[PDB]
Structure 1
Amino acid sequence: MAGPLSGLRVVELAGIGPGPHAAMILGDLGADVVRIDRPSSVDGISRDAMLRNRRIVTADLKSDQGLELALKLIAKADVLIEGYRPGVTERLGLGPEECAKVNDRLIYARMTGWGQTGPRSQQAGHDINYISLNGILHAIGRGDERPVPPLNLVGDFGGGSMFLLVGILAALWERQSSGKGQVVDAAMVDGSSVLIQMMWAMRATGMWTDTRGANMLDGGAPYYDTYECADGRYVAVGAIEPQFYAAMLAGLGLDAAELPPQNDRARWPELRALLTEAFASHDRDHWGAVFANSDACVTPVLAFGEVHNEPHIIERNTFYEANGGWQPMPAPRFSRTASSQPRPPAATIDIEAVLTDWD
C-alpha cells in the first residue's frame, strides 16, 4: 500500500461528515482502513466517493457477536474513529475504557461537534450549528444581509476532520515514546475556533470588527473580493500588498492618481465603484489572460464543471477521473513515499476475512 501511512491500521465506526472524511484521508495516505457499518445500511457498492480507500464490513454492534468481532478488530488496530454522540460507544461496550482493556496502544479518536461534556453535548447539530456558537458564521457574508454558510467546509472539515487527523497523528508520535495510546477529543466547536485564530488575533489588536462585510478579508476591502465581469462571470481579487495592487491597477487601465488610496477605508465606496466599473468592462477570460503570470492576484472564479479545463489544475494532477466525476487526488504530497490513486468503494467483506488478513 502506497504512501507515508503504509502499515497504519484503522477501524472506523461508520458515521457522517468529519469521521468519514478523516478516515478517507488516512486511507488516501496509505493507511489500512476498515469501516464497520450496520447491516441495515450495507446494500451494494457505495456510490459515495468519500468512502474510497476502505474495506467495508457489516456488524450489528448491539448484538453480542457484533460487539465481540468489533473488539477483535480494535484489538489488532492502531486507531479507532467514532463520531456518534457522547455515551454511544460506552453503551455499545466499545467505549475508551473497554478498548483500553483489549489494546492499550489504541488511539481512540472521538469526532463530535459540541464535545464530550457540557450543556449542548447531547444536542443534534450540523456544521452550521457548531460555527454559529463560536462567532464564525456571523462573520461570513455581505453586511446588508444575513450570514451565509461557507458550505460545511469550516466546521465539518477544516475545524473537524482535520483536527481529528492532527490529534490521531500527534498521538501516534506520542505513542513512540510511551508505548501507550490515548483518547483524542476532537470537537468542531474547538477545532473551528483554532481554525479562525487569526481573526481572534486581529480582533485583539483592533484590526477586525464584529461588523460583517467591513474587514480586510470578509469582502469589505475592494482589493479582497470578487467582481462581476462583462459576461456575468466573476474574478477574484486578492491584492493585499501594495505592489500587487499597483500591478492590478495597471492591468485594469486605472491610474493610481485618479483613485482614492488603497487603504483609505472612508473612501472604499468610491474605490469599489471604480474597480467595479473597470472589471465590468471585459469578460472573465479577458481578465484571466491579461493577468496570467502576474502578481496582480486576480484569478478567474471557476465553477466546479470548468475546473478540469484549467492548465494549472491539469498539470499538477490535482484531480483524477472516477465513475462520471472528477475527484481530488490525495493531499498533501510526499517526495519519497508518494500516495497512489485512491481505490474506489469496494463491495463488502466478511469481518472474519479481515481478522485473518490482520493475523
Structure 2
Amino acid sequence: MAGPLSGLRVVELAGIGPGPHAAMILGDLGADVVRIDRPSSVDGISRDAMLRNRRIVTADLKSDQGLELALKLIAKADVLIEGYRPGVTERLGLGPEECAKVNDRLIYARMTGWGQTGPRSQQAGHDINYISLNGILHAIGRGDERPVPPLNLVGDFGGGSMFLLVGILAALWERQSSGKGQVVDAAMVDGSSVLIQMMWAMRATGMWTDTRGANMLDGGAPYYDTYECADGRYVAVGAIEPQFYAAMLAGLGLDAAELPPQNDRARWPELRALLTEAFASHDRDHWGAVFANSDACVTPVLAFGEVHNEPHIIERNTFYEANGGWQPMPAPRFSRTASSQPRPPAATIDIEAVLTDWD
C-alpha cells in the first residue's frame, strides 16, 4: 500500500460523519483500514465514495461471536475508531478497558460531538448543533439575516475528523517512546473551537465583534467578500493587504483617490457600492482573465461542475475521475512516500479472511 502510513492498522466501527472521514484519510495515506459494519445495512458494493480505501466486514457486535471476532481484529491493530454516543462501545464489551486487555498498545479513538461526559453527552446532534453552542454558527452569514450553516465542513470535518486524525497520529508518536496506547477524546465542540482560535484571539484584542456581517473575514469587509458579475456569476475578493488591494482597484479601473479608505469601516457601505458597480460591469470570466497572474486576490467562484475545467485544478491532479465523476485525490502530498489513487469500496469480505491476512 502506497503512502506514509503504510502498515498502520486501523479498525473502524461504522458510524456517520467524522469517524468515516478520519478513517478515509488514514486509508488515503496508505493505512490498512478495516470497517466493521452491521449485517443489516450492507446490500452490495457500497456506493458512498467516503468508504474508499477500506475493507468492509459485517458482524453483529451484539452476538458473542461477532464480539469475539472483533476483539481479535482489535488485538491485531494499531488504532480503533468509534463514533457512537458514550457508553455504547462499553456495553458492546468493546470499551477502552476491554480493548487494553487484548492490546495495551491500541490508540483508542473516540469521535463525538459533545464529548465523553457532561450534560449534553447523551444528546443526539449534527454538525449544525455542535457549532451553535460555541459561537461559530452565530458568526456565519449576512448581518440582516439568520445564520447560515457552512455545510457540515466545520463541526464534522474541520473541527471533528481532522482533530481525531491529529490525535490518532500524535498518540502514535507518543507510543513510539512509551510502548503504550491511550484514549483520544475528540469532541467536535472542542475541535471546532480550536479551529476558530483566531477569532477568539482577535476578540480579545478588540479586533473582532459578535455582530454578524461586521468583520474583516465574515463578508462585512468590501475587500473580503464575493461580488456578482454581469453574467450573474461571482468572483471572490480577498485583498486584505493594501498592496494587493491597490492592484485590484487599478484592475477594476477605479482611481483610489475617489474612494473611501480601505479600512474606514464607517464608509464600508459606500466603498462596497462602488466595488459592486465595477464588478457588475463585466462577466466572471473577464475578471478571471484580467487578474490572472496578479496579486489582486480576485478569483472566479466556480460551481462543482466547472472545477474539472479549471487549468490549475487539472494540472495539479487535485481530482481523479471515478464512478459518477470526480473525487479529491488524497491530501496532503508527500515527496518520498506518495499516496496513490484511492481504491473504490469493494464487496464485503469475510472477517476471518482479514484475520488470516493479519494472522
* Partner secondary structure for residue 248 of structure 1: helix
Alignment correspondent of 1:46: 46
Alignment correspondent of 2:148: 148
> For the residues of structure 2 that align with 1:324 and 1:167, how far apart are their CA atoms?
33
Deviation per CA, 1:319-347, whole angstroms, max 9, x where unpaired?
A: 00001110000000000000000000100
Q: How far 1:146 sits from its partner (Å)? A: 0.3
Q: How far 1:267 sits from its partner (Å)? A: 0.5
* Partner secondary structure for residue 109 of structure 1: strand
1:86-235 correspondence runs (5 A): 86-235=86-235
Q: How far 1:257 sits from its partner (Å)? A: 0.4
Q: How far 1:124 sits from its partner (Å)? A: 0.2
Deviation per CA, 1:69-123, whole angstroms, max 9, x where unpaired?
A: 0000000000000000000000000000000000000000000000000000000
> For the residues of structure 2 that align with 1:52 and 1:317, how far apart are their CA atoms?
18
Q: How far 1:193 sits from its partner (Å)? A: 0.1
Deviation per CA, 1:174-206, whole angstroms, max 9, x where unpaired?
A: 000000000000000000000000000000000
Deviation per CA, 1:13-47, whole angstroms, max 9, x where unpaired?
A: 00000000000000000000000000001110011
Matched-pair identity in %: 100
Alignment correspondent of 1:57: 57
Q: How far 1:151 sits from its partner (Å)? A: 0.1
* Partner secondary structure for residue 227 of structure 1: strand
> For the residues of structure 1 that align with 2:136 and 2:325, how far apart are their CA atoms?
32
Deviation per CA, 1:32-68, whole angstroms, max 9, x where unpaired?
A: 0000000001110011000000000000000100000
> For the residues of structure 2 that align with 1:33 and 1:88, how far apart are their CA atoms?
21
> For the residues of structure 2 that align with 1:344 and 1:249, how far apart are their CA atoms?
47
After the TM superposition, list the runs of 4 or more consecutive aligned residues in structure 1 that deviate by more than 4 angstroms: none
> For the residues of structure 1 that align with 2:192 and 2:335, how far apart are their CA atoms?
30
* Partner secondary structure for residue 60 of structure 1: coil
> For the residues of structure 2 that align with 1:278 and 1:85, how far apart are their CA atoms?
52
Q: Does 2:289 align with 1:292?
A: no
* Partner secondary structure for residue 124 of structure 1: coil
* Partner secondary structure for residue 308 of structure 2: helix
> For the residues of structure 2 that align with 1:51 and 1:187, how far apart are their CA atoms?
22
> For the residues of structure 2 that align with 1:324 and 1:17, how far apart are their CA atoms?
21
> For the residues of structure 2 that align with 1:140 and 1:130, how far apart are their CA atoms?
14
Alignment correspondent of 1:332: 332
> For the residues of structure 2 that align with 1:325 and 1:74, how far apart are their CA atoms?
35
Q: Does 2:253 align with 1:253?
A: yes
> For the residues of structure 1 that align with 2:118 and 2:33, how far apart are their CA atoms?
31
> For the residues of structure 1 that align with 2:46 and 2:258, how far apart are their CA atoms?
59
* Partner secondary structure for residue 81 of structure 1: strand
Q: Which runs of 5+ in 1 are unaligned?
A: none
Q: How far 1:125 sits from its partner (Å)? A: 0.2
Query: How large is the Cα RMSD of the aligned pairs?
Result: 0.3
Alignment correspondent of 1:315: 315
TM-score, structure 1 normalization: 1.00
Q: How far 1:208 sits from its partner (Å)? A: 0.1
* Partner secondary structure for residue 27 of structure 1: helix
* Partner secondary structure for residue 274 of structure 1: helix
Q: Which runs of 5+ in 2 are unaligned?
A: none
> For the residues of structure 2 that align with 1:292 and 1:242, how far apart are their CA atoms?
19
Deviation per CA, 1:208-241, whole angstroms, max 9, x where unpaired?
A: 0000000000000000000000000000000000
Q: Does 2:85 align with 1:85?
A: yes
* Partner secondary structure for residue 57 of structure 1: strand
> For the residues of structure 2 that align with 1:43 and 1:68, how far apart are their CA atoms?
24
* Partner secondary structure for residue 349 of structure 2: coil
Deviation per CA, 1:226-274, whole angstroms, max 9, x where unpaired?
A: 0000000000000000000000000000000010000000100110000
TM-score, structure 2 normalization: 1.00
> For the residues of structure 2 that align with 1:47 and 1:63, how far apart are their CA atoms?
27
* Partner secondary structure for residue 166 of structure 2: helix
> For the residues of structure 2 that align with 1:262 and 1:160, how far apart are their CA atoms?
36
Deviation per CA, 1:301-326, whole angstroms, max 9, x where unpaired?
A: 00000000000000000000001110
Equivalent residues, number: 359
Q: How far 1:155 sits from its partner (Å)? A: 0.1
> For the residues of structure 2 that align with 1:202 and 1:215, how far apart are their CA atoms?
10
